[PDB]
Symmetry: C5
């Protein structure tokens, strides 16, 4: 198989005055004198694809005439999963009412470590409020590296303003993001019927979120396994 001098997206394409198309791939600049390669290189650059420069000399500023396009490159793609039995999960948590989302996250991580035992790694991403979750989830989904995304928050009616608009927007936005990027997004954003901060609700919801974390961990594991199964 031919040597891969550099693989990655074209950082910049420069058509020099000597009929050479200089393209920078994976931090290394390569140029080609082929007339047919110039429109192909331009199309590759404008399509957001990753090309692999192939030549006998892999040094900077070396000519090349061999290149491979697997399937419209990689670009922002190559996501929607990492590997079976070894993947990663992103846990986005809001910092409003942190003392309960913390319990949910601790239960989730503990259960995942108990079952998988190191096969699954969970990364924690902090976020100011429930409204900021859909965009963060979209970014983490398009970046790849993740087989599932979990978002946790505690949306509370404070008795002054109405809270249902933000909850509806967040739920619908998470659904839209997961449909757009084809990465599962599990919802642990919960809106109680009543919460008047009487320390009885405070004691109750700690344990209830402790249970919800384990439930979400099991759901995430099973959905990732099933999605990997039906793709074969």
């Amino acid at each position: 198989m031919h040597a891969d001098c550099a693989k990655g997206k074209i950082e910049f394409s420069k058509y020099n005055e000597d009929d050479t198309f200089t393209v920078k791939v994976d931090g290394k600049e390569y140029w080609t004198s082929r007339w047919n390669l110039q429109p192909l290189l331009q199309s590759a650059q404008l399509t957001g694809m990753t090309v692999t420069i192939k030549s006998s000399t892999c040094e900077s500023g070396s000519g090349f005439a061999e290149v491979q396009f697997n399937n419209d490159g990689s670009g922002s793609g190559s996501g929607s999963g990492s590997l079976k039995t070894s993947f990663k999960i992103a846990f986005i948590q809001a910092r409003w009412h942190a003392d309960i989302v913390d319990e949910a996250r601790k239960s989730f991580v503990a259960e995942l470590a108990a079952k998988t035992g190191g096969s699954v790694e969970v990364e924690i991403f902090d976020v100011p409020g429930a409204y900021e979750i859909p965009l963060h989830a979209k970014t983490l989904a398009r970046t790849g590296r993740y087989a599932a995304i979990v978002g946790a928050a505690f949306v509370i009616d404070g008795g002054i303003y109405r809270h249902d608009f933000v909850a509806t927007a967040v739920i619908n936005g998470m659904m839209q993001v997961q449909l757009e990027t084809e990465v599962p997004v599990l919802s642990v954003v919960l809106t109680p019927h009543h919460f008047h901060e009487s320390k009885e609700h405070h004691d109750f919801f700690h344990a209830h979120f402790k249970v919800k974390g384990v439930e979400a961990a099991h759901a995430a594991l099973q959905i990732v396994s099933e999605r990997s199964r039906i793709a074969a």
Copy 2:
């Protein structure tokens, strides 16, 4: 038609240094020395289309110059139906309150088998909860092979958290997926007015879901037949 050596999507396109464009179709690598075929092959690869390799020699690494493009290839297309009087249906069921979705599914399958008698086959897909249904439906619709998709769940107000957000998101997402992929999606996700788990509701909803399964089977058959009719 010419001898079809291999038909399928271009797994990878490799432009070698000898002015040859090597493309792998249906697991077999083929190369062209034609200058005009290279931009056409690149466009075919970037457009997500399937080409048909036509040549006298069908062995690996054999050159070819004949290719046929039916209609922008197949790619992710060729779905939205399998065949009249012989097709498949995907039954996505949630595992929350399984004892009732099970009754609905059994009624659906029994009625299907009663009328069609083996003409329609039902494949069964499990899912953690109602929130995971739209993405599974989108995947199964884009994969083709299915003339209709059925999603069943039982969304319950548990008395602690509000449940209407998830139900609204699920219904709207199922409709959006159905409009996006042009594959009918029938909804058997139901939200009762009251359910307090007093075994009276438990005994009632078993039979009611038993009825709903037969109703959904009839609706699926009729809608598939009508959609096949108006397309001629």
Copy 3:
């Protein structure tokens, strides 16, 4: 004006080793030896363009060198209307509570026939339930041939499950479809405040839908006339 051997979408394009983009248009296969025509034919095929093969010989397998592209071909386009003072309307009706949608449809057809007197033709399409209307409307709008689409249903709260989710989904889906395809869609899907099946509601809603049919007929005629007016 040059003779039209065949006009329509390219059924299949076959670039043989002979470097000839053999193309089947309107059920007739035509081939060209022009080098410049091959990329143009490929672009037309991938863009869903309808080409008109023009040559002195219109028989199958005859060479051609003349072709006309009016405006990106026709493809799935040429819809959003048929002709002024002579067009068609699609009436999609649900089969749930058929005894009332029947009254609405009869009123609509009778009023149309009374005013236009044969200038407007109404085609009836059957559908199992309200949830299956938006996709049927999208298909009938994309197929062309129709200046307006009418969808009728009777969404009823049965006292067991909640019904507002499906009604909201249907209304929003019809609006989305009519915005997408630029074909007016008139809504005759109605949700009464109360309906307990006491034969008083049954007697009342027959006449009320009888009125609604005439109202919808007048609205459809007015909107089609106005839309045809502002487009000049």
Copy 4:
């Protein structure tokens, strides 16, 4: 600057057998014998752009070799505004409860004429019901010529059917249209809490809509001025 024989969208492109690409622009047919211009003309036609045919002879059927592409042509573009201090506004009004929308429209027009004094022209468009406003707004926004669009209606709960579905659909559709076409759309569709047709409500809402018309006029003027300001 070179003479403009004809400027507009390519009505039809015809590649004759004499290696000439005949294109009709602004009602005049022009042909070119340049080999390089043919793919460029095809791309211009398929991209929905307007080209300006330039030649020493501007008569029909005259050869040309000069053409200018400003920015992907005009096509459906050139909208989202007409000119500062002199623009147009489209007033779409529903014919349901006309006696109140009439007061709103009269107030709007009178206030516009009082402040601008002929600098702003208001065009009136009639529509059978509130459900048919968003598509009309989308058409009038895509056609250009308008810096703002106003939609007025009176959505009323009649006591028989539920009315909130249509109102929600209309508001969301108007917002979606204004986001899609980048033309401001001001909402004067109003849903009162109670209206039982007791002639007290009828007398009150006349004056209230009279006030709302002036309010909408001021809002439209200020938003158009601000949008024109931030674009420099």
Copy 5:
């Protein structure tokens, strides 16, 4: 590195009769006689990309043969952020109930000046009402120059018409805009449960918006810092 005669979007492309492709970049007109550059220049123009004309002579009407395409140009892109530790924020405020949004804005600006001390600059944009916020936010997001966008309004039930439709539309449209343009948009649009203008509510909501401004300032700083962090 080669001299930059002019960098920017192609204002207009003019293919003269002398086989020269004149392109205006950054207010300066440049022409090239290269046959291969003409399709590349046309593709660059139609793709909405910015090219950098490079030649030994940078004067108007000077020939060039060198050009660089970094990554599909800039065009409407280059947004979603300005720089770390030194960026800008757009504060869109509605003029309905200005005496409270003013308090919110003053708190926001004061807190940002207290912490950053001149590192972050806030620009104030006026808007007639809550309905006009999402489109303004979309414009300011697409123009670039901003790492975050804040929208403030006070949606009030006046006791005559229903207000929840507009609030829902505004929240959903703001979330849709922030997902479309990948620029965070923080919500300070608030809908109180009750507000009867008895000057007790007027005194209370002044201080409450004073608090909400500081809260939004902290949330904006945190979200910008985190988004800049995860992008490395």
